[PDB]
Coordinates of C-alpha atoms and ligand atoms in Angstrom, one line a residue:
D4 CA -31.7 -4.6 22.0
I5 CA -28.0 -4.2 22.9
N6 CA -27.1 -3.7 19.2
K7 CA -29.2 -0.5 19.1
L8 CA -27.2 0.8 22.1
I9 CA -23.9 0.1 20.3
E10 CA -24.8 1.8 17.0
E11 CA -26.0 4.9 18.9
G12 CA -22.5 4.9 20.5
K13 CA -21.0 4.6 17.0
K14 CA -23.2 7.4 15.6
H15 CA -22.2 9.6 18.5
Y16 CA -18.5 9.2 18.3
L17 CA -18.4 8.6 14.5
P18 CA -21.2 10.8 13.1
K19 CA -19.6 11.6 9.8
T20 CA -19.6 9.2 6.8
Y21 CA -17.8 9.5 3.5
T22 CA -18.1 7.1 0.6
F23 CA -15.8 6.6 -2.5
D24 CA -15.7 4.4 -5.6
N25 CA -19.5 3.6 -5.8
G26 CA -19.6 2.7 -2.1
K27 CA -16.5 0.4 -2.2
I28 CA -14.8 2.6 0.3
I29 CA -16.7 3.8 3.4
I30 CA -15.0 6.2 5.9
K31 CA -16.7 6.7 9.2
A32 CA -15.1 9.5 11.2
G33 CA -15.4 11.7 14.3
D34 CA -16.7 15.3 13.9
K35 CA -13.2 16.8 14.4
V36 CA -11.4 14.8 11.7
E37 CA -10.9 17.2 8.8
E38 CA -13.0 16.6 5.6
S39 CA -10.0 17.7 3.5
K40 CA -7.7 15.3 5.3
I41 CA -10.1 12.4 4.7
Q42 CA -10.2 13.2 0.9
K43 CA -6.4 13.2 1.0
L44 CA -6.4 9.7 2.5
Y45 CA -8.4 8.3 -0.4
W46 CA -5.8 9.6 -2.9
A47 CA -3.0 8.3 -0.6
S48 CA -4.6 4.8 -0.8
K49 CA -4.3 5.0 -4.6
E50 CA -0.6 5.7 -4.5
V51 CA 0.0 2.8 -2.2
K52 CA -2.4 0.5 -4.2
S53 CA -0.6 1.1 -7.5
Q54 CA 2.9 0.6 -6.1
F55 CA 1.6 -2.5 -4.2
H56 CA 0.3 -4.0 -7.5
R57 CA 3.4 -3.1 -9.4
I58 CA 5.6 -5.0 -6.9
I59 CA 3.1 -7.8 -5.9
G60 CA 2.2 -8.5 -9.6
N61 CA -1.5 -9.3 -8.9
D62 CA -4.6 -7.1 -8.8
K63 CA -7.2 -9.9 -8.7
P64 CA -8.7 -10.7 -5.3
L65 CA -7.4 -14.1 -4.2
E66 CA -10.8 -15.0 -2.9
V67 CA -14.0 -13.5 -4.3
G68 CA -16.9 -12.8 -1.9
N69 CA -14.8 -11.8 1.1
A70 CA -15.8 -8.9 3.3
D71 CA -12.9 -6.8 2.0
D72 CA -14.9 -6.4 -1.3
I73 CA -16.0 -3.3 0.6
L74 CA -13.3 -1.4 2.6
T75 CA -14.5 0.3 5.8
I76 CA -12.3 2.9 7.5
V77 CA -13.0 4.1 11.0
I78 CA -11.2 7.2 12.2
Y79 CA -11.6 8.5 15.8
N80 CA -11.0 12.2 16.7
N81 CA -8.1 11.5 19.0
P82 CA -6.1 8.8 20.9
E83 CA -8.4 8.9 23.9
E84 CA -11.6 8.3 22.0
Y85 CA -9.9 5.5 20.0
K86 CA -9.9 3.4 23.2
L87 CA -13.8 3.2 22.9
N88 CA -13.3 1.0 19.8
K89 CA -12.8 -2.0 22.2
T90 CA -16.3 -1.6 23.5
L91 CA -17.9 -0.3 20.3
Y92 CA -16.3 -2.8 17.9
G93 CA -14.5 -5.4 20.2
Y94 CA -11.0 -5.0 18.9
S95 CA -7.7 -4.3 20.7
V96 CA -6.7 -0.6 21.1
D97 CA -3.0 -1.2 22.1
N98 CA -1.8 0.2 18.8
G99 CA -1.7 3.2 16.5
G100 CA -4.3 1.4 14.4
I101 CA -5.6 -2.0 13.5
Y102 CA -7.0 -3.8 10.4
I103 CA -9.5 -6.6 10.8
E104 CA -9.6 -8.6 7.5
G105 CA -12.7 -10.6 8.5
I106 CA -14.9 -7.4 8.4
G107 CA -12.7 -5.6 5.8
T108 CA -12.4 -2.8 8.3
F109 CA -9.5 -0.8 9.6
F110 CA -9.6 1.4 12.7
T111 CA -7.4 4.4 13.6
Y112 CA -7.5 8.0 15.0
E113 CA -6.4 11.5 14.2
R114 CA -3.5 12.8 16.2
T115 CA -1.3 15.8 16.8
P116 CA 2.5 15.6 16.4
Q117 CA 2.8 15.7 20.2
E118 CA 0.8 12.5 20.6
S119 CA 2.6 10.4 18.0
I120 CA 5.7 10.5 15.7
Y121 CA 3.4 9.2 12.9
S122 CA 0.8 11.3 11.1
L123 CA -2.7 10.0 10.4
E124 CA -1.9 9.7 6.7
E125 CA 1.2 7.7 7.6
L126 CA -0.7 5.2 9.8
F127 CA -3.5 5.2 7.3
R128 CA -1.1 4.2 4.5
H129 CA 0.4 1.4 6.7
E130 CA -3.0 0.0 7.6
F131 CA -4.2 0.2 4.0
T132 CA -1.3 -2.1 3.0
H133 CA -2.7 -4.8 5.4
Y134 CA -5.9 -4.6 3.5
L135 CA -4.0 -4.9 0.2
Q136 CA -2.0 -7.9 1.6
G137 CA -5.2 -9.6 2.8
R138 CA -7.1 -9.1 -0.5
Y139 CA -4.3 -9.7 -3.1
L140 CA -1.3 -11.3 -1.4
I141 CA -2.2 -13.8 1.4
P142 CA -4.8 -16.5 0.9
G143 CA -7.4 -17.1 3.6
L144 CA -8.1 -14.8 6.5
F145 CA -5.6 -13.3 9.0
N146 CA -4.5 -15.9 11.5
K147 CA -6.6 -18.6 9.7
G148 CA -5.0 -19.1 6.3
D149 CA -2.3 -21.6 5.7
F150 CA 0.5 -19.0 6.1
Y151 CA -0.7 -18.6 9.7
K152 CA -1.4 -22.2 10.6
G153 CA 1.5 -24.1 12.3
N154 CA 4.0 -21.3 12.8
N155 CA 1.7 -18.4 13.5
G156 CA 4.5 -15.8 13.2
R157 CA 6.1 -17.1 10.0
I158 CA 5.1 -14.2 7.7
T159 CA 4.9 -11.5 10.4
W160 CA 8.2 -9.7 9.7
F161 CA 7.2 -9.3 6.0
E162 CA 3.6 -8.5 6.7
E163 CA 4.5 -5.6 9.0
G164 CA 7.8 -4.7 7.3
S165 CA 6.2 -4.3 3.9
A166 CA 3.2 -2.4 5.4
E167 CA 5.7 0.1 6.8
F168 CA 7.6 0.2 3.4
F169 CA 4.5 0.6 1.2
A170 CA 3.4 3.5 3.3
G171 CA 6.2 5.5 1.5
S172 CA 4.5 5.0 -1.8
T173 CA 4.3 7.9 -4.3
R174 CA 2.9 8.1 -7.8
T175 CA 6.2 6.7 -9.3
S176 CA 8.0 4.8 -6.5
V177 CA 8.3 3.8 -2.9
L178 CA 10.4 6.3 -1.1
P179 CA 12.0 6.0 2.3
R180 CA 10.1 7.4 5.3
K181 CA 12.0 9.7 7.7
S182 CA 10.1 8.4 10.7
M183 CA 11.1 4.8 10.0
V184 CA 14.7 5.6 9.0
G185 CA 15.0 7.7 12.2
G186 CA 13.9 4.6 14.2
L187 CA 16.9 2.6 12.9
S188 CA 19.7 2.5 15.4
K189 CA 22.6 4.9 14.9
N190 CA 25.0 2.1 16.1
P191 CA 25.5 -0.5 13.3
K192 CA 26.0 -3.3 16.0
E193 CA 22.6 -2.6 17.5
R194 CA 20.7 -3.2 14.3
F195 CA 18.9 -6.5 13.5
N196 CA 20.6 -9.0 11.2
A197 CA 18.5 -10.7 8.5
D198 CA 18.1 -14.0 10.5
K199 CA 16.8 -12.1 13.5
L200 CA 14.4 -10.1 11.4
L201 CA 13.1 -13.1 9.3
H202 CA 12.0 -14.9 12.5
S203 CA 10.5 -12.0 14.3
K204 CA 7.0 -12.2 15.9
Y205 CA 4.5 -9.9 17.6
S206 CA 5.5 -11.0 21.1
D207 CA 9.1 -9.8 20.4
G208 CA 7.8 -6.1 20.6
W209 CA 7.9 -3.3 18.0
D210 CA 11.5 -3.1 16.9
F211 CA 11.2 -5.6 14.0
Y212 CA 8.7 -3.2 12.3
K213 CA 11.6 -0.7 11.6
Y214 CA 14.1 -3.4 10.6
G215 CA 11.4 -5.3 8.5
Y216 CA 10.8 -1.9 6.9
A217 CA 14.5 -1.5 6.2
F218 CA 14.7 -5.0 4.7
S219 CA 11.8 -4.4 2.4
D220 CA 13.4 -1.2 1.1
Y221 CA 16.7 -3.2 0.7
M222 CA 14.8 -5.8 -1.4
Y223 CA 13.0 -3.2 -3.5
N224 CA 16.2 -1.2 -4.3
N225 CA 18.8 -4.0 -4.3
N226 CA 17.2 -7.4 -4.3
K227 CA 14.0 -7.3 -6.4
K228 CA 14.4 -11.0 -7.2
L229 CA 14.0 -12.0 -3.5
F230 CA 11.0 -9.6 -3.2
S231 CA 9.5 -11.2 -6.3
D232 CA 10.1 -14.8 -5.2
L233 CA 8.7 -14.1 -1.7
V234 CA 5.4 -12.6 -3.0
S235 CA 5.0 -15.5 -5.6
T236 CA 5.1 -18.1 -2.8
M237 CA 2.6 -16.1 -0.8
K238 CA 0.1 -15.7 -3.8
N239 CA 0.5 -19.4 -4.5
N240 CA -0.2 -20.3 -0.8
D241 CA 3.2 -22.1 -1.1
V242 CA 4.1 -22.1 2.6
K243 CA 6.9 -24.7 2.3
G244 CA 8.4 -22.6 -0.6
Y245 CA 8.2 -19.5 1.5
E246 CA 9.9 -21.3 4.4
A247 CA 12.7 -22.6 2.2
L248 CA 13.2 -19.1 0.9
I249 CA 13.3 -17.7 4.5
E250 CA 15.9 -20.3 5.6
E251 CA 18.1 -19.7 2.5
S252 CA 17.9 -15.9 3.0
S253 CA 18.6 -16.0 6.8
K254 CA 21.8 -18.0 6.4
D255 CA 23.0 -16.1 3.4
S256 CA 25.9 -14.0 4.7
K257 CA 25.9 -11.9 1.5
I258 CA 22.2 -11.0 1.9
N259 CA 22.9 -9.9 5.5
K260 CA 25.9 -7.9 4.5
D261 CA 24.0 -6.1 1.7
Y262 CA 21.1 -5.6 4.1
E263 CA 23.3 -4.0 6.7
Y264 CA 25.0 -1.9 3.9
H265 CA 21.5 -0.7 2.8
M266 CA 20.6 0.4 6.4
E267 CA 23.9 2.3 6.7
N268 CA 23.0 4.2 3.5
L269 CA 19.5 4.8 4.8
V270 CA 20.7 6.1 8.1
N271 CA 23.4 8.2 6.3
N272 CA 20.7 9.9 4.1
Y273 CA 18.3 10.5 7.0
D274 CA 18.3 14.3 6.5
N275 CA 17.4 13.8 2.8
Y276 CA 14.1 12.0 3.6
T277 CA 10.7 13.4 4.4
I278 CA 7.3 11.9 5.2
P279 CA 5.7 11.0 1.9
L280 CA 2.3 12.5 1.9
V281 CA -0.3 13.3 -0.9
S282 CA 0.1 16.6 -2.8
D283 CA -2.3 19.5 -3.0
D284 CA -2.9 18.6 -6.7
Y285 CA -5.7 16.2 -5.6
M286 CA -7.8 18.9 -4.0
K287 CA -7.5 21.5 -6.8
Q288 CA -10.4 22.3 -9.1
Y289 CA -9.6 21.6 -12.8
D290 CA -11.2 22.2 -16.2
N291 CA -13.5 19.4 -17.2
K292 CA -11.9 17.1 -19.6
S293 CA -13.7 14.4 -21.6
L294 CA -13.4 10.7 -20.8
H295 CA -12.7 10.1 -24.5
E296 CA -10.0 12.7 -24.4
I297 CA -8.4 11.2 -21.3
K298 CA -8.4 7.7 -22.8
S299 CA -6.8 9.0 -26.0
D300 CA -4.0 10.9 -24.1
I301 CA -3.3 7.9 -21.9
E302 CA -3.3 5.5 -24.9
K303 CA -0.8 7.7 -26.6
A304 CA 1.3 8.1 -23.4
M305 CA 1.4 4.4 -22.6
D306 CA 1.4 3.1 -26.2
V307 CA -1.6 0.9 -25.7
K308 CA -4.7 0.5 -27.8
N309 CA -8.3 -0.6 -27.5
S310 CA -8.3 0.3 -23.8
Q311 CA -11.5 0.5 -21.8
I312 CA -12.2 3.5 -19.6
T313 CA -14.9 3.6 -16.9
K314 CA -16.2 6.4 -14.8
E315 CA -16.7 5.9 -11.0
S316 CA -18.5 8.1 -8.6
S317 CA -17.3 9.2 -5.1
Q318 CA -19.1 11.6 -2.7
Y319 CA -17.4 14.9 -3.8
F320 CA -15.9 13.9 -7.2
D321 CA -15.8 11.4 -10.1
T322 CA -12.8 9.3 -11.1
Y323 CA -12.0 7.0 -13.9
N324 CA -10.3 3.6 -14.4
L325 CA -8.6 2.9 -17.6
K326 CA -7.9 -0.8 -18.3
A327 CA -5.5 -2.0 -21.1
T328 CA -3.1 -4.7 -22.0
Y329 CA 0.6 -4.2 -23.0
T330 CA 2.6 -6.8 -24.8
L331 CA 6.3 -6.7 -24.1
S332 CA 8.1 -7.2 -27.4
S333 CA 11.2 -8.8 -25.8
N334 CA 11.0 -11.1 -22.7
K335 CA 14.3 -10.6 -21.0
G336 CA 13.5 -12.2 -17.6
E337 CA 11.3 -11.3 -14.6
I338 CA 13.3 -8.4 -13.0
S339 CA 14.5 -6.8 -16.3
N340 CA 10.9 -7.0 -17.5
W341 CA 9.7 -5.5 -14.2
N342 CA 12.1 -2.6 -14.5
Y343 CA 11.1 -2.0 -18.1
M344 CA 7.4 -1.9 -17.2
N345 CA 8.0 0.2 -14.1
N346 CA 10.0 2.7 -16.2
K347 CA 7.6 2.7 -19.1
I348 CA 4.6 3.3 -16.8
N349 CA 6.4 6.1 -15.0
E350 CA 7.4 7.7 -18.3
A351 CA 3.7 7.7 -19.3
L352 CA 2.8 9.4 -16.0
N353 CA 5.4 12.1 -16.6
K354 CA 4.2 12.7 -20.2
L355 CA 0.6 13.1 -18.9
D356 CA 1.9 15.4 -16.1
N357 CA 3.6 17.6 -18.7
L358 CA 0.3 18.1 -20.6
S359 CA -1.8 21.2 -20.1
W360 CA -4.6 19.6 -18.1
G361 CA -3.9 19.7 -14.3
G362 CA -6.0 16.6 -13.7
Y363 CA -3.1 14.4 -14.9
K364 CA -1.3 15.2 -11.7
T365 CA -3.8 12.9 -9.9
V366 CA -3.1 9.8 -12.0
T367 CA -1.7 6.6 -10.5
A368 CA -0.9 3.6 -12.6
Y369 CA 0.3 0.0 -12.4
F370 CA 1.1 -3.2 -14.3
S371 CA 0.3 -6.7 -13.1
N372 CA -0.5 -10.3 -13.9
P373 CA 2.1 -11.1 -16.6
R374 CA 1.3 -14.1 -18.8
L375 CA 2.6 -15.7 -22.0
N376 CA 0.2 -15.5 -25.0
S377 CA 0.4 -17.9 -27.9
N378 CA 3.7 -16.8 -29.5
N379 CA 5.6 -16.6 -26.2
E380 CA 5.1 -12.9 -25.6
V381 CA 4.7 -11.3 -22.2
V382 CA 1.3 -9.6 -21.8
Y383 CA 0.6 -7.3 -18.9
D384 CA -2.6 -5.9 -17.6
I385 CA -2.4 -2.1 -17.3
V386 CA -4.5 0.1 -15.1
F387 CA -4.6 3.9 -14.9
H388 CA -6.6 5.7 -12.2
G389 CA -7.3 9.4 -11.9
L390 CA -9.6 12.3 -11.1
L391 CA -12.3 13.0 -13.7
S392 CA -13.9 16.0 -12.0
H393 CA -14.8 17.5 -8.7
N394 CA -18.4 18.3 -8.1
Ligands
LIG1 CA1 -6.4 -12.9 2.8
LIG2 ZN1 0.7 -3.3 10.8

């Protein structure tokens, strides 16, 4: 059978397999892709994931039973061997990487600095965001859901721009990427305006990635309300609402002005930025700490009670998920509430970091899915994720 011939080709070029989160993440890699680097990628995914949920405000799969219930990651040794993915898997290789939502799989390759301005972790983080968008943000499958029907390129600027943006995720924020900021034109006149960006499409080329990235960072830092409203329409599959929002935003001269001002500030601070990558804290061996002890410290740190903590197994370590709810005593509106929760969660992470156990340096956390209880109070789901112990 032809299928047997293909798998032998896969096993040849991608002999190594690494599994995380009880098999929910499977990384197939070439022999030359470093084991330590792959482990780092897992932790990188958690930083992006937590920031993504904070901003998107949903951590529930939009559709249960989809192939992205398991995330498969394919990493080739180098750019040259990546081209074989077309024959082996059947997908386009004219890119740094690609995510195929239908099979919950994203493909990429290790590279030296000479071959690309982006590191593997950087591209990994970008591609991971597509997986997050597919699973939690955009209903239906890529190119098939309602957001793609009709005008196929309607969400493209945001889908790619936010993917670039979320690649700068850290444990507490989303920070600018030197590689993306450097791509922005030094001449203000040459930069995209909002209207141009908001109607960009794949056939336009690759420039809108950088400007979409810049607009995302603008929204996050200076227009959280627009970011929030955009993701709400997406989650609701409200295509008309999104389109109305795009038209209003494109023709808003103040939005364009503030967007261009944000880019100037980004370009001005170029030397201050670095490539956000995962710290060495994730690889270090730590003293064993009890699950009950971790739960207790996190409950104290976050001021939540009756939390549920669950251990999960990966290939070379165990991790935990702590689930809790937090009730906001005063509802002061979406953005003010957002900032309160973001600051509160970050304060919790800092408190845990300041504790003696070095394991707390691996913790990522988010808040999501706000709702009103009886008595009109804002209840948030709260999730903390961290290393339990290396094997
Ligand atoms: Ca989807
Ligand atoms: Zn992309």
